[PDB]
Design a protein around this ligand. Structure first.
Ligand SMILES: [Cl-]
Ligand code: NA
Length: 259
């Protein structure tokens, strides 16, 4: 299914292509919709870059304190935090927080560069058992979201399983996992997406993204009141190049699968 019918109907009414994967850790059950199709990740890929840096810090414990210069030449399209620090430095911890909580694209590019480029973030994903994730490009071009283009894509199923490993599992050490969850709970950009379809009392850590072709994404770890955590991935994309974002579709999908 009944939830599948409602998602198919939401998709048809929306005019786009919807991918959903819910993991309920209470009973290890899943709700899946187009969950093995590829979708452009857009800014949701920032979680994997931050996670790769945190993994690196398990071996180099002072890594997150290392400072990185911010130059005018680093600025790209959307840099709400980095633009305030031009000609100074930011620590890798501050860049990680900026990437996750404000979606700062300079922060993302500095994280990518630190771990060795997009192929190195992809190799980290493979290390975790994720053979679907691929990060191909840097900011800002990784957000083009051209239909049929596999670059910078993953599937709802793979991202949900990887997010479970990163936030609820043991992919990262205890301190690092706690830090990632803390940053995601502090996201400033997610109130209109998955969170908008959930009860007010539930706690959410999420990362949003949007891009070309009206691509509107959110990936979330959810702590419902008095229940075990959920993982929810909602990806959406549209047929027209200049389509407007549809965060309401993500909220509605969240409401349907958690009822
Ligand atoms: Cl258009
Ligand atoms: Na993935």
């Amino acid at each position: 299914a009944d939830v599948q019918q409602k998602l198919a109907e939401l998709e048809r009414q929306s005019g786009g292509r919807l991918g959903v994967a819910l993991i309920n850790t209470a009973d290890n059950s899943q709700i899946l919709y187009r969950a093995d199709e590829r979708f452009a990740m857009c800014s949701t890929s920032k979680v994997m870059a931050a996670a790769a840096v945190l993994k690196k810090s398990e071996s180099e414990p002072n890594l997150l304190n290392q400072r990185v210069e911010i130059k005018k030449s680093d600025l790209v399209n959307y840099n709400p935090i980095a633009e305030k620090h031009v000609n100074g430095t930011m620590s890798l911890a501050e860049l990680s927080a900026a990437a996750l909580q404000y979606s700062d694209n300079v922060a993302m590019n500095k994280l990518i560069a630190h771990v060795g480029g997009p192929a190195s973030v992809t190799a980290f994903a493979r290390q975790l058992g994720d053979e679907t994730f691929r990060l191909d490009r840097t900011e800002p071009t990784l957000n083009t979201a051209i239909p049929g283009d596999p670059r910078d894509t993953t599937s709802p199923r793979a991202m949900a399983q990887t997010l479970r490993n990163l936030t609820l599992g043991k992919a990262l050490g205890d301190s690092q996992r706690a830090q990632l969850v803390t940053w995601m709970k502090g996201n400033t950009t997610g109130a209109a997406s998955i969170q908008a379809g959930l009860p007010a009392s539930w706690v959410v850590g999420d990362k949003t993204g949007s891009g070309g072709y009206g691509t509107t994404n959110d990936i979330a770890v959810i702590w419902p009141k008095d229940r075990a955590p959920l993982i929810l991935v909602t990806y959406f994309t549209q047929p027209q190049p200049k389509a407007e974002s549809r965060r309401d579709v993500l909220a509605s999908a969240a409401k349907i699968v958690t009822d």
